[PDB]
Symmetry: D2
Subunit: 115 residues, 4 copies
């Protein structure tokens, strides 16, 4: 699994479950092409997005549909979505974990890049 | 000043100075139209991006050019930029502060929204 | 103003108003001696805690009473308080801003340290 | 495992390995009594701190020795340590994960409380 997404809810102190996540790759003409998507599990994780073969060097965008998540909880949030944009680079370690911590008017994201 | 951006550096414990910021607005055709840009000051603040008149209802994207910041400091960071996308002024005019706290492999952004 | 505290609320997108803050200094006997206290303003800021003369070198603990804040708002949060423990002024006087961003089950704190 | 600690490094984008963690319980006389301790693993996690039998309701303090961590990397940090103080409560879910994200002048902590 070269790319994993983990989402946490800072209001409830829980995984953020059933959050839609869309991954895009930047194409030559500077547009964003769909690449992978899924919904977080009961543990707030989304595995199996891509394969080592498919996940080549490039710029990627991970879009997390935070607005739907909060609205389903009856909370009006600030952001349309959370967006994580990064270059995948073969130099560094093999596995990318993109973590996000959600509040209604804030989010934090960190990358854990390991072998 | 209805839109302000403040950026801190979690490695140095300082304002993040000279951080480029580009703001876009979603147009009728659903493309991102350039709206305003600037750079943070010595206090890590960026004022004067827009006016109450021009900051109409819409979906805005605040791009904070974190890679250019870390690279200008000779550090290789993870993200290309921090993106903050939100609907503004859809219940009337508000004042928005977008705050961001930067590390090379992490950032945190929050909004402070007040009613004038 | 050598020690200031600023607190934001990540649920409301607002300053965190009326947050109690207690500051302690580690004494010669290694106990925490009360040093200064106050409450954040309508801007989420707390000024006037101490003076340059009284803010000598030492290990300080800034306790931000987050539970009392969330409970005063009728919310049941996770933490008792946010604690920020640091050595101050050991290379000469500095100005410290302790910022904190609060959610019911999470907080983030950063320091901005400047040289007057 | 009713109490797990996970520590991440926001400068390197990695688990924070070999970080000392001390857990204390608040005793009747308002002092902090040692309760459990350990060092984070290669995955930045510290398991096996306590047992369900031992982890009763009460106020606990998790002290993470961030200062030593940064100094071992040649970085001068701000905090003496990171401190997480909370009440354990039998009402809510069973398992506490205390997560911390470390930078030299900042840290963030969130609780993930699950069944
Ligand atoms: O000029 C003003 O009137 C006020 O501006 C504030 O600037 C900031 C600036 C900030 O930049 C932050 C932050 O950045 C965060 C923060 C902390 C952790 C995170 O994970 C995310 C955000 C909290 O409070 C803040 C305050 C000053 O602290 C305050 O003294 C001053 O009077
Ligand atoms: O089971 C899995 O497959 C994987 O679950 C993930 O667990 C977590 C769990 C977490 O709990 C966090 C966090 O909580 C923080 C965090 C803290 C404060 C912030 O402001 C932002 C992020 C970031 O990464 C994380 C990762 C890990 O990637 C991995 O150890 C585990 O095998």
């Amino acid at each position: 699994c070269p790319l994993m997404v983990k989402v946490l809810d800072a209001v409830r102190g829980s995984p953020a479950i059933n959050v839609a996540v869309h991954v895009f790759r930047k194409a030559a003409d500077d547009t964003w092409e769909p690449f992978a998507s899924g919904k977080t599990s009961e543990s707030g994780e989304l595995h199996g997005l891509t394969t080592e073969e498919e996940f080549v060097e490039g710029i990627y965008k991970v879009e997390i549909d935070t607005k739907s998540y909060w609205k389903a909880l009856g909370i009006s949030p600030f952001h349309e979505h959370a967006e994580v944009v990064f270059t995948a680079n073969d130099s560094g370690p093999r596995r990318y974990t993109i973590a996000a911590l959600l509040s209604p008017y804030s989010y934090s994201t960190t990358a854990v890049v390991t072998n």
